[PDB]
């Protein structure tokens, strides 16, 4: 809103021919929207997006707890756990699986048991670098090319 | 001898920079028009909320010589005096359109003076104060601090006359003190409801036998006596006493024992709002995903009714609404009508997000749209390529996906479209669900009024009803707010402001107000003050029926008519009532100097009397 | 226009559950737009798009004339 307001003002000026371009009105609402982003001190960006129906026992959470990847600024890899299928119509990650995969850079599928592994295979068919294993069927198959 | 023409304004309320009530909205939406008038003479005062203030306040340094014009210097010295003595506050701008200046007292910083104060209150106004009531402790702490602050200013400032406006009992305690200590400010007290009012209407009768209850005994009965006293005390110590609406001024007069000198109806920032077809189409998409597998009615011949607001079953008249719809359903069947009413209840409740069922409907109907679209563009390519090369268009490939997508819409035999979109966290005890069960509106094909309960706020990013409330509202045809206890009723008013006809009642404040300005303008007003409960419901159905019949022209007239009632509710118009009240406060405070400014003795019995 | 008409018809059917999909109305306007593409017999698609202010002398045209493309 604020920028298109600026556009109108720059254009109107120009077309008429013959320095704060943000009026006070616009500085207020900008300043409000910036402050609402403030987070409660020492709060870190969560490692999980959902309410876990068994927070304490969950294998994934507990493992990332055990390695203490807690998303603090010092940490150079961040951790996001999304315990639900992806759907384009979600408030959080508005992507279909196929969209989300394409937007990523590298898929990591360190499988121990996996007679084929359709997940890596279809990752690759959408043109995305991927790490599988040699106990994965798709891995084994790839290893012979 | 001070200047009435060039006076100060101090507006005090528990809500200044924390949305804990609907008053937050009133003050926030009134800012732009009063800040326009008073510039930096105007301050809002309120209790500092240590959890939120950082998101809403541009914190200022109040010591810098620049922080105040020279004439407004007195307030600055005033504040220092205050910090010297150990009272900690936050001075700043409240980041809302208008950016009014704000003083936010830290109730912890003064919590010591507590007991000295609960006492000093009792010994000048016999107001009790148990120690287990945090709200009243907080209201007393606030009261003493503000009277203090106003004392100082009254002292140090001698150029300006000082008016000080308080909203609601929680900010009322200053009011007696000001009168007791002959402080040189003129006070105003606005109540947006009464304590007895609310508590009396929280069971299931009022507007008739309210003028005959023993207030002292009834307050006692709810364990409310001390709160009641604070509310009365404030109402009598003010120089001008007011309420938001005519109907509330009736309940006020008999419950607090002082007849309001006037009414301060809540206006809106109309620009902030100001499409129907475009938005009605999003509601069409939802309805199709919801009635998938038994879509047997013509959307071009269906009307959307809605009720919205806080989940207050009795007071918002959610009961009257559902009842009247059941009765509108009969009338419509018997009359063998061709039209359909889909009625939404948007009132938030404990829920566990969307029902697996409702989520599926939308997804399968979305896949249909997708597949049809893919198939039609194929035909497009093929019809065109034929015409250009000159000299069953569906291949079987397309037939197959088409067939699959239509098969997915089939719904389990005998299963009906849900009356609710969410997982209820209390399916058994929910007042709304139970009422719609009692009347058996279950969305079967025979049923001419369908029913959709959406127990959650509307956000445009939802899988189900992808609208913001303001979007949804415009998409509709009629809003229905049969309220029983409602001092103002923003939801009706704002519904109207967006150009959508709406039914209110005469025990609503906004109703009462509208009633003095018939039905041709998009406002129907059911009578709950005079007709019996049943006659009332019946009048509702009369209004609904009448609206169902409206032809294309008859509706498109009404719509255009309400969209022009719009500009009546802007603060630009309503705010003149604040001016009437503030001026009356002056006239009563400095009777003599007022005659000099005006040129006679204008009448001072009420605000309308003056002007 | 014609195809989106078809779309509406296919969708409405489907959403209601429980072969010429082009009505006559649509066949007429299709047939008209196809015929307006007919070119005057033996007319070939021009080798040039503009009115030449010196058609006869122009080097480019004359060269492509000489090679009879
Ligand atoms: O009304 C006549 C007086 O009016 C003018 O006095 C000033 C005082 O000079 C100020 O000091 C101040 O008084 C404040 C007071 O400072 C403040 O602490 C608070 O006092 C309360 C106390 O908190 C409460 O617990 C209880 O004990 O009552 C006290 C008041 O009696 O509030 C006081 C009032 O605001 O501001 C006033 C404003 O009038 C004038 O200068 C005096 O000469 C004159 O007598
Ligand atoms: O038409 C077939 C059936 O007819 C009868 O079923 C009725 C029920 O009797 C009605 O009470 C109602 O059922 C509602 C239910 O009342 C309502 O609470 C809601 O159920 C939600 C639930 O709240 C939510 O938390 C979650 O679990 O999803 C549920 C829905 O899937 O909505 C129900 C459906 O409107 O309406 C039905 C018919 O639709 C008869 O009793 C049935 O035996 C018969 O099959």
Curated annotation (Swiss-Prot), chain C:
Subcellular location: Cytoplasm, Cytosol
PTM comment: Phosphorylated by the cyclin-CDK PCL10-PHO85. Phosphorylation causes inactivation of enzyme.
UniProt function note: Glycogen synthase participates in the glycogen biosynthetic process along with glycogenin and glycogen branching enzyme. Extends the primer composed of a few glucose units formed by glycogenin by adding new glucose units to it. In this context, glycogen synthase transfers the glycosyl residue from UDP-Glc to the non-reducing end of alpha-1,4-glucan.
Family: Belongs to the glycosyltransferase 3 family.
Additional detail: Present with 14600 molecules/cell in log phase SD medium.
Oligomeric form and interacting partners: Interacts with PCL10.
Protein name: Glycogen [starch] synthase isoform 2
UniProt organism field: Saccharomyces cerevisiae (strain ATCC 204508 / S288c) (Baker's yeast)
Annotated gene: GSY2
Whole sequence portion shown: 384 to 464 of 705
């Amino acid at each position: 809103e604020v920028t298109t307001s600026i556009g109108k003002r720059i254009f109107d000026h120009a077309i008429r021919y013959p320095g704060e371009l943000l009026k006070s009105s616009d500085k207020v609402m900008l300043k409000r929207r910036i402050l609402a982003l403030r987070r409660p001190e020492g709060q870190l960006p969560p490692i999980v997006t959902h309410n876990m129906v068994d927070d304490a026992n969950d294998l994934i959470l507990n493992k990332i707890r055990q390695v203490q990847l807690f998303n603090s600024p010092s940490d150079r890899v961040k951790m996001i756990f999304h315990p639900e299928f992806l759907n384009a119509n979600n408030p959080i990650l508005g992507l279909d699986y196929d969209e989300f995969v394409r937007g990523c850079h590298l898929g990591v599928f360190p499988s121990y048991y996996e007679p084929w592994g359709y997940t890596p295979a279809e990752c690759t068919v959408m043109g995305v670098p991927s790490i599988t294993t040699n106990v994965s069927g798709f891995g084994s198959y790839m290893e012979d090319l | 001898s001070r200047d009435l023409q060039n006076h100060l304004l101090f507006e005090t309320a528990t809500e200044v920079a924390n949305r804990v009530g609907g008053i937050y909205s009133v003050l926030k939406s009134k800012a732009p028009i009063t800040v326009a008038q008073y510039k930096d003479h105007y301050h809002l005062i309120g209790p500092l909320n240590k959890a939120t203030y950082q998101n809403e306040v541009d914190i200022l340094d109040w010591k810098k010589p620049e922080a105040f014009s020279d004439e407004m210097r007195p307030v600055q010295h005033a504040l220092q005096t205050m910090e010297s003595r150990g009272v900690h506050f936050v001075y700043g701008r409240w980041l809302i359109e208008g950016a009014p200046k704000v003083i936010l007292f830290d109730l912890d910083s003064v919590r010591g003076y507590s007991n000295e104060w609960k006492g000093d209150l009792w010994s000048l106004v016999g107001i009790p104060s148990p120690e287990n009531d945090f709200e009243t402790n907080d209201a007393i702490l606030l009261g003493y601090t503000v009277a203090w602050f106003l004392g100082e200013v009254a002292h140090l400032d001698s150029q300006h006359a000082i008016v000080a406006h308080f909203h609601e009992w929680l900010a009322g305690v200053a009011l007696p003190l000001c009168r007791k200590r002959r402080i040189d400010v003129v006070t105003i007290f606005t109540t947006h409801a009464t304590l007895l009012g609310r508590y009396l209407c929280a069971s299931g009768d009022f507007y008739n036998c309210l003028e005959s209850v023993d207030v002292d005994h009834e307050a006692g009965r709810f364990g409310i006596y001390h709160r009641y006293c604070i509310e009365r005390a404030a109402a009598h110590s003010a120089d001008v006493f007011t309420t938001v609406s005519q109907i509330t001024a009736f309940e006020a007069e008999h419950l607090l024992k002082r007849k309001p000198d006037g009414i301060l109806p809540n206006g809106l920032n109309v620009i902030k709002f100001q499409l129907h077809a475009l938005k009605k189409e999003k509601i069409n998409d939802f309805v199709r995903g919801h009635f998938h597998g038994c879509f047997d009615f013509d959307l071009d011949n269906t009307l959307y009714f809605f009720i919205a607001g806080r989940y207050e079953y009795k007071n918002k008249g959610a009961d009257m609404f559902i009842e009247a719809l059941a009765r509108l359903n009969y009338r419509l069947k018997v009359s063998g009508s061709k039209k359909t009413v889909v009625a939404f209840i948007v009132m938030p409740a404990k829920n566990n997000s969307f029902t697996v069922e409702a989520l599926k409907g939308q997804a399968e109907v979305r896949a249909l749209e997708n597949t049809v679209h893919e198939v039609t563009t194929s035909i497009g390519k093929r019809i065109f390529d034929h015409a250009i090369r000159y000299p069953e268009l569906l291949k079987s490939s397309d037939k197959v996906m088409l067939k699959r997508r239509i098969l997915a819409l089939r719904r389990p035999e005998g299963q009906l479209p849900p009356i609710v979109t969410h997982n209820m966290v209390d399916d058994a005890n929910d007042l709304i669900l139970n009422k719609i069960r009692q009347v058996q509106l279950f969305n079967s094909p025979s049923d001419r009024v369908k029913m959709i309960f959406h127990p959650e706020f509307l956000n445009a990013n939802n899988p189900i009803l992808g609208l913001d409330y303001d979007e949804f509202v415009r998409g509709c045809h009629l809003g229905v707010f049969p309220s029983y206890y409602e001092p103002w009723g923003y939801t009706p008013a704002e519904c109207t402001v967006m150009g959508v006809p709406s039914i209110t009642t005469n025990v609503s404040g906004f109703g009462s107000y509208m009633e003095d300005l018939a039905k041709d303008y998009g406002i129907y007003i059911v009578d709950r003050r005079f007709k019996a409960p049943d006659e009332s419901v019946e009048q509702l159905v009369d209004y609904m029926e009448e609206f169902v019949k409206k032809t294309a022209a008859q509706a498109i007239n009404q719509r255009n008519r309400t969209e022009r009632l719009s500009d009546l509710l802007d603060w630009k118009r309503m705010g003149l009532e604040y001016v009437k009240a503030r001026q009356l406060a002056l006239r009563r405070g400095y009777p003599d100097q007022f005659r000099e400014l005006v040129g006679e003795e204008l009448n001072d019995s009420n605000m309308d009397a003056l002007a």
